Structures are given as C-alpha cells and as structure tokens.
Structure 1
C-alpha cells in the first residue's frame, strides 16, 4: 500500500460507479470499515444533582422557549424599520389564457389597503397570453414576462417573475388559482408584522368552466359562490364520490396553522403562498433541476426552513383552483436530508447531493493533529455526512496538508482566509456546511466512531431539539488519556446561564444556528459559551452522558483578566432575553474564580 482516503467514502464511490468493483475487494474494504468504527462511546460516571442552581433568583424567569421549531408566535415575542411598499404577485402561466383571465379578474376585485403588482409569468406558451394581459392593463398594475418554450419550466418561470418583482414582498399564484377578494390584504397584513414568516394560503376546487372572466369582474363575489367540485374516487372495487378538498386544511387546524408543526415545509405549495423576497437571497430560488414530477415546493420550503424562515397558514388567503379540462419521498431524498432522508447501509449506501450532517472545523496552525481530526469524522457510523474546514490564515503547512489530502475528497471541503480569530473562522466554516445537522470539532482534537450517530438518534426523538451535546475525555496532545471531562448530568437553561455546561461535542440544527446572531467574532475566547448560550434561547437541548470527544488538554498574567472579562459579558449579553432587572456579576475580584452573584439593579 501507501496512502489513501477512508473506506467509508471508498465504498460509496464504489456503490456509485455503475461498474461493480470485485466483491472480493469491496468486502475487504467494508470489513476494514466495520472494524474501524466498531468501538462504542463509553457511558460516563453517573452523577446526581440540583437541576436549577439554588442561588438562582426566584423572581427571574427566562423567556419561555417556542412550542415547536416553527412556532412563530414565540418568534413574534423576540423583540430584537421596514418598508411596506407592495406585494409583487407572480402568476406562472402555460396557456389556459381563458383561465389566467378569471384569475386576473378575481385579482381586480381585491379589497385591500396595500399596493400590489401582478406579474403574469409566461413559460413559452403557445396560446396568446399577452393578448389577455393587455386587456387588463387598464385594471391592474400589471407586467408581463416571457421565456421561450423549452419544456416544463415552472421553477424557471417562477424565478423570472420573482426576479422581475420590484417589491420586498412577493406572492406566487398558479394561473388557475383564483384568489378571493381578501387575498392580498390577508397576506400583507401578516407580512407587515413579521417578515420572517412565509404565509401559506389554503385552497378549494371549483369547476369555473361555465363562465367567462366577465362574470367575475361583474359579480365580485361569484368566486366564493361557485360550487366545489365532486370527485369520483374508487374505494376497494366500488366507487365512492366525495367533495375533493385541500388535504392540508385538516392538518392546518391541528397545528394552530402550522405553529406547532416541526416540518412545515411539507405544506408549502408554491401555487399560492407569500413571503419576504429577502429569503430568495438567503435560501435561494426554485431548483430548476426539478422535472414535472415535482418536489420543488418541499425542497424550496425546506431551504426556507433551514435558514430560519417560519411558516404560517392564512384562511384569508383562500384560493380557488379551477378544474383543468404517491411517492414524493423518493423525490426529496437527495436534496432534503432532514425529515425525509433515511439511513442506507454501507453496502448499498451512497453519497448525497446534500449531506445530512456537516462537521465544521476551525483550523489554525493545527499542523500534525488535523489529518487525524478529519478522518475521525470521515470514519463515522454516519456515512451520510461531510467535513468543512476553514483555514484561519495558518502560518504553517496546515493548508498545504489539507490539499494534498482533501483537495479532491468527495466528502471534505476547506477554505482559506486571512486570520481573523476563532469567532470568524467558525462563521466561515459553518456557512460552508450544506447539511442540516451540524457538529463542532476543533483542529487538534478528534471524535469517537459513533459520536455523530449517537446525537443523531436524539434529534430524531425530539424534532424540536436545537442542540445535543455529549461529554469528553481530557487528552494528551500526543493522544494519551489524563482525565475525563467535566460532565454535568442534565441540561437546563438556568444552569447554562450560571456555568458553561455544554461539554464538548455539540450538535445543532442549522435552522437553530440561523436563528442566532452567529459566532461572536470580537472575543479572544468564550466563543463556545456564547454560541451555545445563544442556542439555548432558540430551543431545548439534550445531553447524552457518554464520552464521545477526545480533547487535547493544552495563562500569562495579563491574559487572564480577559478570560474572566469575556465570561461574564456573555451572560450579560444574554440581555437579549429582555432581562434588565438583574445582572450576572462576579462575586470575587480574582482571575481564575468563577463564583458569581445575581446583583439586582
């Protein structure tokens, strides 16, 4: 032999090539994998303690957490000016002019206080769409965008309009989705209060066939009067017809309009939605790689979620789908890791467009202990992950080593930058990660073969979890054991705002991270505590009591005053919670002391 890349990854690339590597080889490598990721994290010393420090004030109560990952009421509380100009409404159209007409009519009948433009988006229609639009030029503040015919390009056309949209609030409407008179108002009135929430309107099905667009401009309510169509469903051999309905509405009333749902994107359907345009630049636009089978909605909604955008249902946004003359799970799979992606076995397992996990690593001068650091994650029971490193202007071979090692690794990705400190390094690396579950791994340390896996099981139990940390063992730079890391048994916010109990190896929901101000780039240290204190405000944490992190154990007078300094700021900075009646002051005037006192002000 000589040198190489992990077997974990080796197998996936093999399972990929349509030309089967000889079983004899494949097996030999799989085994080598199985044995290198065989050890199991060893549980830790079972302790016993005071959940919420007694010293903790009995008049102080941190702002209650959110009741789910999409709880927008709680998001509303989070205090923290905007321009409420108008609502650019994009209507994707492929022929059906006589219908776009009706939809344009029901858009003339809008009783709202907001300015709204209608952007008819034509994706290479055959019928003459511009003819229609011109007819309305005298009623709506209408615009027309067109792209040539090159297939089914809804995502592409959706993008044109949204691009053409001039306001800060966009809305999307299939050309067959006739809004009700209160559509604009309903969306806008909510987008004006919270712009971090993507309103989703419901729908009903109507056979608008017996009418022309004139009937609607006339009867400015006719749209709410036309009977919902009926469906001839086949139930076990014999026919059963019922009133076709929006399958989502049932779910809407059972989640308080998705305020409690932990997977709102499952209901996001671009045929009638509204949101702040800023999100397009944050989570991207509709994926044009999607064919007519769909998935683009969920996949888009997912990325909205992964950034921190919320989801909400509006009844005032009811749209009417005009009657046109199964296995979605296999469509997301690749681009939506979170809820949908299920584990494959190394044998049949294969690389993923978007990894389920992203191990970020801030690296500065971690010369020799960095190739050990990266393989400690590439060699994990969870094969569906990636490693993103950020060279913080190392003054040593670090970066050079990363290249002659990972410059072509399908599962590793780095980025160099001029040294800006540890707070930054991270932001840069985290931003590099494309996965939903994100863990921390410093340069000189290294993990345990099932660290990531162990955390992953905890996220799956409570999809409300924002973070999950394990415990660690203090290690010799050389690699020798010399202690077991501090391990506070149970997690609670109070204990956190009293002492840094988030032992190392941490894992957080990218969405949760995005709901935070990110890493603090102006402090020499206390970076971890800050980030994780910030996280505690976003959601609950879960601690596993096993040793999954091997940490190297690596104080000149003046310095110290900084450390003490930083530590207390962090807790104070947590004024974010709108807490001003107290203050976490030191109790002593010593450097290495951490004893604190809740002095009132």
Structure 2
C-alpha cells in the first residue's frame, strides 16, 4: 500500500513528512537499486534511410527550420476580422513620463484603429488626471486597481480584460513608441494571428522634454540620443527569432503584441510573480508550449525612458536544471508527463504506473484516463493512486483509444510527454534516454526507443521490431516508430491530436501527424515491454486503418500519389504507390 521510493524522498526533502537520516537513506538506497538496471541495446543492420521504392518525383513538404519557424508555419495550410489593437499600458505613477508615451501614441501613423488602456497598479500620483488631459486626442480608457504591492501581473490582466479588440499589445508607461509601432504590429498580426510579436527597445533621457514637446514635434522620439537592448543582437543572428527554439526568453513584457485568442488558449500572466519577474518568460513559455510562435518586429521599436529565479518552478523546458535525489523536490509544473490510456487493465495498471514512477528521472507525472473500463480498473486506480502527488487519473465513457489518449494528454501539465499503454511497462531509464536526445537537439518533436515482446504472464516472447535509422519517408511507408515514444507538448499542439474515429492505427496516425511538424530521433535500445495476446473481419478493418492513416497524411497537399495495398491479404502490409 506504500508509494514509490522517489516520491517519498522528494516529500521528505521538502520537509512535508518526517524521515530520520537512517530511513531517509534506507529509502534512498532502495531507490538506487530499483533504478540501477540500464537498457539493453537492440541490434542494428545495413538499412537504407529512404525506402528503395520511394517515388522518385514525390517530395515530402520540408519540416520547419526550427521549433519556431513562422515562415514554415505560413506555408502550412488546410482549414477573421481585424477591428483594432488594444494597447494595455501598465503604469505605476510615472505621470510626466506616461504623458510622454501617450503623446507619442497620438502621432501614430497607421491604418488600424487602436484604443489605449492605461493600467494603473494603484499609483499614488494622480494618473487619472493626465489621461483626461488626452481624452480628445485618443480613444483612451482608464483602468485602476488598489495598491497591494508589485502587482504588475494583476494589472496587465485587468487591462487585458478591459481590451475590446481581437488583438492586444502590452506597453510599459515608460516605453515611448515610434510613429510606426501600431502599424508594424497590426501589419503582421493581420497575416497570422498564430505568431506573437516582440518589439526591440532603445534607451533615452526624456528629462529635458515635457509631453508638450513630443506633441508638436512628432518625430522628436526618433532623434534623442541614448546601453543596448541585449536582445537586439540575438535577434538579427536568428533571423528575427525564426531560428530560435527558446523564443520566450526574449518575450519582454514591456513591448509585445499578440492575438487575444492566446490568453484563453494559454492563460494569463501568473499573478504569483510578486517578488520576482520572469513572468514574461513564463507567460511566453506557456504560449510556446501551446503552439504559439514568436517573431521580433523591427518597426516595433520603442524607447525606454530612464526612471526619475523561481521560473525553476514553472518552466521546465529550458530553465529547470536537474537536481540530485537527496536534493530533489516535486515541482509545481513537472518536466515529464507520461500519458496512459487505460481500459480493462485490472491486472496490469499497477506494474505499469510503477514502472513509470520508478524512473531515473523523478521530475515527472503520470496521467491516466479510465476509458469506461468494465473491470475494476478504476477501483485499483483509486485505492492505489487516489491521494498520490505524482499520479492523476480521470474517468469517462469508453469512447475508444484515440479519445482516451486525448483526454490523457490534455490532462498532462509537463512539457515532455511519454506514451505508456496500460498493459505494457517501462525500463528504469527509458525517460532519461529520450530526455538526453531532446536536450541535444532542441528542434526535436519526437524521440523513440525500441522494445521487446512480452507475455501476458511476463514470459519473454521476442525482441521488438527495430528499424535503426529514422526518416520521414520510411515512416510514411511502415510504422517504424517503435515504442516507447516521447514527444514534446508543443509539437502535439501543432497537430490535430488523436484520431477518435479509427479503432486502431491510432498510434501510426499520431506519429504521422507529429512527423510533419518536426524531426524525430531514434534510439536503438530496448526500454519498453509490450504484451501481445478470433476475427477475420476485424483484421479487415485493421489493414484498412493502416492504409487510411497513411494517406490522411496527404494533409501535406499531396494528390499525385496513393499509398495503396500490394494485396488484399489481412496480415500483409506490403504497399505500392499508385499514380493519379
């Protein structure tokens, strides 16, 4: 009835359960032996990357240049009103300076409408006063909340709630915008509301200028001298973030614009960031994982007028550095999330879930979906993991494997997701191995190992099928994405999730949808154990789905070819490309 060694240690470290130095390390010792076995390497062979009979004129649409290739995103297609831009200006009483920015906003040269919401975070100076001073020159609104500390996040969310248009832009009160600021944003958002926009900043002393100066001389901003925005170099070197895999690191909250639909898809600014900051990188980290893009805007230049690291807990993707077990403590947002789709898995679920909790990597969680199990899977799940801090389940009506998967994956909170079916089990270092490949090529959408075939009793049946080198062309020919697969949250959110209509091939289908968004990496080691177990019509629909899935992949705009069967023999998966 006990819980895994790791989770127990982590709780103790965080001092939430008492454990004397003798038990603490008797449990640590136990955790070490249980995760000591390493993975056995599978066997390789002289394989050729691209299949031999791969159509000589057929060309798979190129992948993106990086996880953040908005250009690549642009040329992607399939299957809408630009009313204006809502400009939220978080302000903590820097009156005269605010007026200056406001002034610079009156001189905007754009074709789009734009309102201005001054977000006063309980200023002591009378800010309302200077806003009225502009009521005629601007479609300006005024918003204020009481003073209860450094509530930068709270105010940004108030102003954002107040915003009336489908597009918003955040701009600190000290950030004077150039004359083509508004225009440079709307110009881009209009083309793709799927990419967040970042504006560079410069530095200037506005001390020798009142707001009156900027109003009559609508260009004085592009003149005053000046310290360089550390990001600017990083910008041109990565073709305006187009080649960045960590774009949220450059998402400064003083000047950015994006489609308001992202607030609801990814959430708002974390109001917990009171004594910290990095809420930008955290907010943008969430946009990132939810499929949002980032592009740095040249014309979005603004001037920062001079004034008169627990991301560790919320951003696993790039910041969080691995910690030792004796130091390890649970994280608010875990790094790894193993999703499990369970149905009638009474006798195997525990071994399954435990094989996951007992991993080299303890910074993870397990999310399960009870797909209307008929046996007492749910009861086992309840008396074993109900009050467990690293395991979460949710029940529903049996809607099939695809549906169970989606529910399973939307439940995940981590960045790296792993698939573990309720009847199979992992090796104590599978997550770690895949993690290593991910940390090595931050462009990767998926990394998969191989496996071995197991008996429903445990007995060894045989080593699993193993195709040594991955290639998009080999996957589009045969399911070579052996199990255990571990795919990035972001990549998944760039696809249509799992197919809830097919009765099988649900996996071949997913990794097919994922093989379009990014580069996969294969590891030739056995880190998974898959169990194997009276129809001839059910096998009919089985070879149907295998084929259906491969051509649904046509969602790559390919019509000149059809991945057709070489025979109508159930068990056979031989193919042939027929022209049209």
> Which range, TM-score by smaller chain?
over 0.9
Larger CA deviation: 62-71 vs 13-22: 13-22
Matched, 1:318 2:298: no
* Aligned-residue offset at 1:346: 0.8
Distance 2:388 2:152 in 1: 35
* Aligned-residue offset at 1:169: 0.8
Larger CA deviation: 196-205 vs 390-399: 390-399
3-state SS, counterpart of residue 339 of structure 2: strand
3-state SS, counterpart of residue 107 of structure 1: helix
Distance 1:526 1:219 in 2: 66
Distance 1:153 1:493 in 2: 48
Write the deviation string for residues 416-442 of structure 1: whole angstroms up to 9, x where unpaired.
111111111111111111111110000
Distance 1:81 1:6 in 2: 46
Distance 1:322 1:267 in 2: 20
* Aligned-residue offset at 1:331: 2.4
Match of 2:161 in 1: 163
Distance 1:575 1:143 in 2: 49
Contact in 1 for aligned 2:337/2:367 (Cα 8 Å): yes
* Aligned-residue offset at 1:80: 2.1
* Aligned-residue offset at 1:135: 1.5
| Pairing of 1:542-581 with structure 2 (within 5 A) | 542-581=521-560
Distance 1:407 1:206 in 2: 57
3-state SS, counterpart of residue 391 of structure 1: strand
Larger CA deviation: 458-467 vs 136-145: 136-145
* Aligned-residue offset at 1:81: 9.4
Relative to structure 1, is the Cα distance of residues 28 and 81 closer, same or farther in structure 2, using a 3 angstrom cutoff? closer
Write the deviation string for residues 214-261 of structure 1: whole angstroms up to 9, x where unpaired.
11111110111111xxxxxxxxxxxxxxx6110000100110001001
Distance 2:15 2:244 in 1: 39
Distance 1:484 1:475 in 2: 9
Contact in 1 for aligned 2:366/2:392 (Cα 8 Å): yes
Larger CA deviation: 88-97 vs 555-564: 555-564
3-state SS, counterpart of residue 461 of structure 2: coil
Corresponding residue pairs, total: 580
| Pairing of 1:31-46 with structure 2 (within 5 A) | 31-46=29-44
* Aligned-residue offset at 1:291: 1.8
Distance 2:290 2:229 in 1: 27
Match of 2:261 in 1: 278
Contact in 1 for aligned 2:176/2:302 (Cα 8 Å): yes
* Aligned-residue offset at 1:43: 0.1
Write the deviation string for residues 144-164 of structure 1: whole angstroms up to 9, x where unpaired.
111111111010000001111
Contact in 1 for aligned 2:11/2:17 (Cα 8 Å): no
* Aligned-residue offset at 1:507: 0.5
Write the deviation string for residues 157-215 of structure 1: whole angstroms up to 9, x where unpaired.
00001111111111000011010000011011110111110000000011011111111
3-state SS, counterpart of residue 234 of structure 2: helix
Distance 1:118 1:584 in 2: 55
Distance 2:6 2:564 in 1: 49
Write the deviation string for residues 364-418 of structure 1: whole angstroms up to 9, x where unpaired.
1111100111000000000111000011111121111111111111101111111
Structure 2 residue ranges without an equivalent (≥5): none
3-state SS, counterpart of residue 575 of structure 1: coil
* Aligned-residue offset at 1:470: 0.4
Write the deviation string for residues 473-496 of structure 1: whole angstroms up to 9, x where unpaired.
000011110101110110000000
* Aligned-residue offset at 1:550: 0.4
Task: Name which of 88, 91, 97 aligns with 1:90.
Answer: 88
Distance 2:39 2:343 in 1: 28
* Aligned-residue offset at 1:456: 0.4
3-state SS, counterpart of residue 245 of structure 2: coil
* Aligned-residue offset at 1:19: 7.5
3-state SS, counterpart of residue 269 of structure 2: coil
Distance 2:344 2:201 in 1: 57
Relative to structure 1, is the Cα distance of residues 19 and 417 closer, same or farther in structure 2, using a 3 angstrom cutoff? closer
Pairwise CA RMSD: 1.1
3-state SS, counterpart of residue 538 of structure 1: coil
Tell me the TM-score normalized by structure 2: 0.99
* Aligned-residue offset at 1:278: 0.8
* Aligned-residue offset at 1:590: 2.1
* Aligned-residue offset at 1:20: 6.0
Distance 1:298 1:513 in 2: 21
Distance 1:380 1:588 in 2: 43
* Aligned-residue offset at 1:21: 2.1
* Aligned-residue offset at 1:468: 0.3
Larger CA deviation: 582-591 vs 202-211: 582-591
Task: Name which of 555, 559, 563 aligns with 1:584.
Answer: 563
* Aligned-residue offset at 1:45: 1.2
3-state SS, counterpart of residue 576 of structure 1: coil
Match of 1:69 in 2: 67
Distance 1:573 1:82 in 2: 27
* Aligned-residue offset at 1:128: 1.0
Distance 2:355 2:565 in 1: 39
3-state SS, counterpart of residue 121 of structure 1: strand
Distance 1:190 1:81 in 2: 20
Contact in 1 for aligned 2:444/2:521 (Cα 8 Å): yes
Distance 1:385 1:53 in 2: 37
Write the deviation string for residues 340-381 of structure 1: whole angstroms up to 9, x where unpaired.
111111111111111000000001111110011100000000
Tell me the TM-score normalized by structure 1: 0.95
* Aligned-residue offset at 1:589: 2.1
Larger CA deviation: 43-52 vs 6-15: 43-52
Distance 2:42 2:574 in 1: 26
Distance 2:418 2:8 in 1: 23
Distance 1:258 1:583 in 2: 37
3-state SS, counterpart of residue 334 of structure 1: coil
Relative to structure 1, is the Cα distance of residues 573 and 323 closer, same or farther in structure 2, using a 3 angstrom cutoff? same
Contact in 1 for aligned 2:63/2:519 (Cα 8 Å): yes
3-state SS, counterpart of residue 358 of structure 1: strand
Structure 1 residue ranges without an equivalent (≥5): 228-242
Q: Which runs of 4+ in 1 moved over 3 A?
A: none
* Aligned-residue offset at 1:594: 1.1
Distance 2:147 2:340 in 1: 46
3-state SS, counterpart of residue 583 of structure 1: strand
3-state SS, counterpart of residue 409 of structure 2: helix
Relative to structure 1, is the Cα distance of residues 13 and 134 closer, same or farther in structure 2, using a 3 angstrom cutoff? same
Task: Name which of 470, 485, 492 aligns with 1:506.
Answer: 485
* Aligned-residue offset at 1:277: 0.8
* Aligned-residue offset at 1:293: 2.8
* Aligned-residue offset at 1:555: 4.7
Distance 1:367 1:38 in 2: 28
Relative to structure 1, is the Cα distance of residues 423 and 112 closer, same or farther in structure 2, using a 3 angstrom cutoff? same
Match of 1:540 in 2: 519
Distance 2:457 2:507 in 1: 24
Distance 1:208 1:18 in 2: 52
